[PDB]
Design a protein around this ligand. Sequence first.
Ligand code: CLA
Ligand code: CLA
Ligand code: CLA
Ligand code: CLA
Ligand code: CLA
Ligand SMILES: CC1=C(/C=C/C(C)=C/C=C/C(C)=C/C=C/C=C(C)/C=C/C=C(C)/C=C/C2=C(C)CCCC2(C)C)C(C)(C)CCC1
Ligand code: SF4
Ligand SMILES: [Ca+2]
Lengths: 101, 80, 178, 202, 39, 733
Amino acid sequence: LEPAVAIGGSTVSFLALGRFVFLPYQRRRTEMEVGPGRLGPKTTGDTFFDRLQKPASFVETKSKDPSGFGGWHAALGHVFGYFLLACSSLQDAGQVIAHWG
Amino acid sequence: AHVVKIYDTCIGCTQCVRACPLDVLEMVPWDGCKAAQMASSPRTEDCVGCKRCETACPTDFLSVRVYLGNESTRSLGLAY
Amino acid sequence: LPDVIPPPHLNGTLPGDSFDPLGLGLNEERLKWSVTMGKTNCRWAMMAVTGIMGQELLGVPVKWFEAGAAEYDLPVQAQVPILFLVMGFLETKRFQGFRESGFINSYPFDPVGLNSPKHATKEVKNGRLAMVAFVGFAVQALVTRTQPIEGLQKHLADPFGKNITYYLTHTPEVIAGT
Amino acid sequence: LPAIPLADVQSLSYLDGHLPGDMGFDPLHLGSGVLSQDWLRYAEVVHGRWAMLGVVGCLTPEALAMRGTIPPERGVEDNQTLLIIEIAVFSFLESKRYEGYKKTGEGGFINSYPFDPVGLNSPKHAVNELQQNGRLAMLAFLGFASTAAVNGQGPIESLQTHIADPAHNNVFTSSVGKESCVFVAVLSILPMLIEANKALGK
Amino acid sequence: ATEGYPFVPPDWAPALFVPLTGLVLPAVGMAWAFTYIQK
Amino acid sequence: TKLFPKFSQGLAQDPSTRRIWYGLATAHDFESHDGMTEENLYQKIFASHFGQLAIIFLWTSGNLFHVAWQGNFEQWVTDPIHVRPIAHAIWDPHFGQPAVEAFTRGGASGPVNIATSGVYQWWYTIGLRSNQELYVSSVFLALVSAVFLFAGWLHLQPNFQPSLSWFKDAESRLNHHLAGLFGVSSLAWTGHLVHVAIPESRGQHVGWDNFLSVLPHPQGLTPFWSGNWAAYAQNPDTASHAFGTADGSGTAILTFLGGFHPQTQSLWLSDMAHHHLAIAVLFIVAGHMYRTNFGIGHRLEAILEAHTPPAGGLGAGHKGLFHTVNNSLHFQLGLALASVGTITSLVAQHMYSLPPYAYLAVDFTTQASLYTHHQYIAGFIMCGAFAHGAIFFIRDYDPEQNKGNVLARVLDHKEAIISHLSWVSLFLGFHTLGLYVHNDVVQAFGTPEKQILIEPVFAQWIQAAQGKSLYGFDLLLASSSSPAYSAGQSLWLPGWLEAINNNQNSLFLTIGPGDFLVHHAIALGLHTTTLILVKGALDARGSKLMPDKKDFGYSFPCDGPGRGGTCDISAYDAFYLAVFWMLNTIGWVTFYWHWKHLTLWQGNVSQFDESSTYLMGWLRDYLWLNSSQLINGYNPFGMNSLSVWAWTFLFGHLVYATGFMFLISWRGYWQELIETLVWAHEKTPLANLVYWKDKPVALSIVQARLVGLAHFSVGYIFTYAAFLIASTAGRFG
Ligand code: CLA
Ligand code: CLA
Ligand code: CLA
Ligand code: CLA
Ligand code: CLA
Ligand SMILES: CC1=C(/C=C/C(C)=C/C=C/C(C)=C/C=C/C=C(C)/C=C/C=C(C)/C=C/C2=C(C)CCCC2(C)C)C(C)(C)CCC1
Ligand code: SF4
Ligand SMILES: [Ca+2]
């Protein structure tokens, strides 16, 4: 019900889940997928400034495989998976969603 | 004009040269069949495209092929 | 020169030197044209924000947003035509300077014998800060329906309360003005 | 040709500047033929002649008190038959002018007299000043025609009203022309578009 | 016009625009097209 | 050597009229132009796309301009039931005294024509209420069209032309199209619905001068940032509520009410906003699936390579399909045309059943014209999808790349696929024709009881499963104890049940034995058109009669009169033959729609239900009875408003009959005739001074098929549009 405890307790649970139990599975699962290049063509010498993966170091900062943007990506679980529970206003608005039967 | 081709599966029966009504195909000597002669097409610019050679070809599939292309005054059969 | 651990720029002879996560450059011609855009956009924004601050300090019962309609001797009907000719002249002449290179005002360079050499990075940096301050003035004015000095006073008067979050939660009172 | 219309505009390749009044402005390439531009030029100058004479033709009557400010033929002494002798004398005169123009060009004469330098004045600068003054009067006569928007106000009178109030008495607001603003808007952005197009197409 | 300027057209509009695109425009279009078709 | 076909030196060196005609045919086949590379091809396509967008926006801007100048929009808003919409004015120096007196309708000063496009209801529904808003919005659309034209030219310049990899990047394209083009645009549309369309429907005027001072909801975003999202659905608009004023209005914005509106007979405007908002959130969250230049996302090639069932069900699975699809353009074009052609039909089927615009169900000509227009457009696009699939198989299908996959695997049993399609088509044809002829003969012998009448017990069961309690099937959504009925009983089931139980709207019409046979006729037309198109696509690169067909291109005349004769053997010829079947299928579905609605609108629903079983009943009560007012447009006793429709009704017949000429008569007869005319012009006095620059020749075989099909399709379209609008407009509003 409380928005502060439903989307706050959500963020941390989705973050800790993705950082403690679903991180090696995600890293092991993303190894079979290749990047944007059309099977690796010449880019720098052909002016392909948009397809090249963004640099910004992209190296280990934490431990056991970190995540720079994954901490902001997997964090969307906070609003994707619990802003729905946070907005469950139909439990007190009369519109019953129990679906009897 | 049209592009005529003669494949190696020719038997040298000399029927396409007899069926051509514009003297496009000819028979040159060869060393790959029993008749020792293979068809050729030197006057390709005079091809009109009536495809009588393909009907006269007895082998399966046809040894001669008439691929139609650009049209000129001679290939369009114009008399004016 | 750098800020934090990622690798630096692809070109490093320009005033501002930092990183860009999208990388809209990588084209020397687009880099030269785009660097001129930054200087001219910042020129307009620097003047604009100092103008809004001045109009706000001096005053004449009208906010910069409501300053569009406020009498005047010559009407907006004739205001546009005169504005186009003046601006069209000045701007087309300025584009003439870019072909031969450099930044020109009335004519090429326009340097009234003042400091220029190492006094440049500050000009770009001041311009950039004024650009972000102007976009803040606009969304601040749109959300709070007030002038930047009043907003500063409202935050100065009360910090924890009457904040930006307050301006998002309450809209039926902010518009009404209660 | 070195002056140029708006700021710095690439003068058209056909206009080498040989003509005395080459401002470098000639949009849609209406004139580019060698034998056609000379005749068009003769047209432009003849136009200026009729228009300059016209501008000062309405200026005189308008300045003093008289009728015909907007409409002519209040009374007159010749009706219809006049109009016939007008076209007859002009047809003879015009046929002579066309014959003279074909021989040497830049036909400046009355009746049949190939060259008309009575006053013995004909320098280069005077040829040029004829053109610039003709262009000006051709653009001023339209303002005399634009008295329609200003209605009863005459040419000298329209000037008088504009002197009384300089902000609420102009084409942009006091006239019914609200599209004059859009005209000056597109006339102001057009230059930049030409430079932009030519620059982009490197 | 009055308070309707934005694309409001004068009365003799179809009397001078239909006689234009129905005869003058197809004539100049076909003339330019024929000269372009030929050498 | 002329210079008109600049893209083809071969046609440029043609000394006949064939150069002119063909110069207008291969003008868009950029894949077969002289000196064309892959990069040049992709850049040319990118430019033509912008040109198409510019002409689309210019066309809609012109529509807004014409309705704002001559249409009675302001007069139509004050009375959207009695007055008729006005398209534009009519200026014709050929018109007579009675034509000017009779063409003036809708309260106009001059002659005008009523609009059947239905744009008045659409603009009145979205919020346009004045004659000035259409003006300012028309100039805005013209401005955005000008920008698109500049953008197309801009990208056709050096240092601005995109590379080949930019075109061959599917991950970022799909991410941006699903997030920005499909999601952000939908979010902006629900924002307009909640900020302008919702307050304008309740009398509160909201425009550009006061939208920043009026709050869409009393709470004012306070619930959006709080755990009280149901506040936006507190008081919906009541039943007794006028669509123009605030009499009986509400303050809710994001509701969920099934059914329609009691006065406008359209969906609730407070529901489309909720719909577009949910669709926007779904598309934005779905646009972050593929991997762009970041460390997250998916890879299309990896998903396709990973989708291969074990135990050899599909062999190689989808291996190589990524390069096959991405490397080819006709594959993407065929997929896009198939999806667009399917959703166009979906739009047609949902707009008549669930009207989305206010006062649209009252306008009977608008609904018929809109349904017919959308169905014919869908049919043409569906034929184009299969045509491009055949073009893909001939032009860019290399068998060595995707060996043993599903694309090469479906090609191994093309005879099995084509043969089973042939069996289904023969079954449906034999039985639907036999049932119709049996009912016809039995009805003709003065005995209607003898005729066979099959009740569609399956579609009636579906209708009873969705809410209609007329048939009597005690199933879910029509019962009172089913879990599906208790679920949603407080959400949207009362409004949905109230709209589906009414026998006056078009939502789930009551079907009977007359709809069974027509549905089988529709199935027959679909399977036959699919058979022709699928056979022409699979047998495109070779057959047993001609194995080297792939070496002859896509559109060739034949391969001589040898080996029995090879007339109409190319895939182009197969598509040509399928266009007729597509026209017949769309004609059958539109005849069915128009007759069922034509009998429902006049309160004589028992006419079609008992007279639609026999073909004589179809010809009498549909083609002969409803054509009484159309042919009476101009008789020796004067004329009326319907005379223009009567004229174009015969104009379509003339175009159709001229197409039969190019379809029946073949080129050789005409070639000899043209030769005789050449001799005549050369040996004639005073006319031999002039001479043709290009030698006159007869049209080609492929050209003759194309011109005949164009004449056939144009006549088929014009005749039915004239009859539909005239028969509906003539006896209804
Ligand atoms: C598509 C646009 C279009 C337009 C705007 C018109 C307009 C017109 N058509 Mg028409 N027509 C069209 C398409 C069009 N048509 C098509 C596609 C067809 C083929 C089916 C026809 C077939 C057709 C026929 C068979 C006839 C017309 C006729 C007419 C005229 C109506 C009768 C009339 O009042 O006579 C006009 C009266 C006038 C006073 C007009 C005189 C002005 C003309 C147009 C120019 C003359 C000025 C002259 C050149 C001066 C030279 C200057 C000199 C100093 C050099 C009218 C002006 C009728 C006609 O022409 O009348 C005899 C007629 O018989 N049309
Ligand atoms: C419980 C066991 C089980 C079952 C039942 C299935 C079942 C299925 N798997 Mg799966 N799989 C399993 C276990 C299982 N799998 C396991 C343990 C793994 C390892 C994790 C996989 C991994 C796997 C992968 C990677 C894939 C599948 C796929 C498939 C599907 C298609 C398989 C196939 O050969 O196509 C069917 C065989 C054919 C020959 C197709 C016949 C085509 C017909 C004849 C066309 C007729 C059309 C005609 C017009 C119909 C008229 C109707 C009218 C309305 C038009 C199928 C439904 C594939 C899939 O996802 O497809 C959806 C897929 O790629 N499986
Ligand atoms: C978020 C950024 C973004 C956006 C907004 C767009 C937008 C667009 N791109 Mg683009 N693109 C992008 C990023 C983006 N792109 C990037 C990053 C790349 C490089 C990787 C590309 C590469 C690219 C290419 C190569 C092409 C485009 C093209 C297009 C245009 C598609 C044609 C169209 O208008 O259909 C409109 C689509 C919709 C309105 C939504 C779909 C409509 C469906 C069918 C439902 C219908 C809605 C509803 C039921 C109807 C209501 C209306 C009715 C009431 C009247 C479009 C304007 C094409 C183009 O050039 O222009 C034609 C094209 O060729 N893009
Ligand atoms: C997204 C849509 C789309 C696109 C981009 C293409 C693109 C292409 N098509 Mg394709 N096609 C489409 C849809 C599309 N098609 C559809 C919907 C169909 C089904 C009708 C077809 C059926 C089709 C066939 C059969 C063929 C192509 C071919 C081609 C290629 C070149 C031919 C060409 O376009 O030149 C331009 C063509 C013309 C300019 C001819 C225009 C004449 C039209 C059809 C008649 C207009 C009707 C009438 C005059 C209207 C006036 C009425 C009157 C009363 C006023 C080209 C790459 C050809 C090909 O692959 O090359 C061999 C090929 O043979 N298309
Ligand atoms: C394919 C479409 C079609 C169908 C499905 C029908 C069906 C029917 N028609 Mg019709 N008809 C059709 C087309 C069709 N017709 C056409 C195109 C025409 C125009 C030429 C007609 C004109 C027509 C007329 C004029 C009449 C019919 C009649 C009938 C009914 C006759 C029943 C019968 O023949 O008695 C029974 C036939 C047999 C029992 C045949 C015996 C075959 C062997 C000996 C027995 C089979 C083995 C046995 C079942 C044992 C098997 C064991 C098993 C259990 C294991 C029947 C329902 C008649 C009727 O009464 O209308 C209702 C009638 O008047 N039709
Ligand atoms: C030739 C070719 C081509 C083309 C093709 C085509 C043209 C195709 C198509 C097709 C189509 C045109 C299809 C369609 C479809 C659809 C479908 C198949 C669907 C579906 C779905 C479902 C399953 C549903 C369900 C449901 C729901 C969910 C809800 C309600 C209920 C129901 C049940 C209804 C190409 C180029 C590729 C190449 C190759 C070959
Ligand atoms: S299309 Fe004509 S030329 Fe070809 S086989 Fe048929 S009849 Fe003969
Ligand atoms: Ca309004």
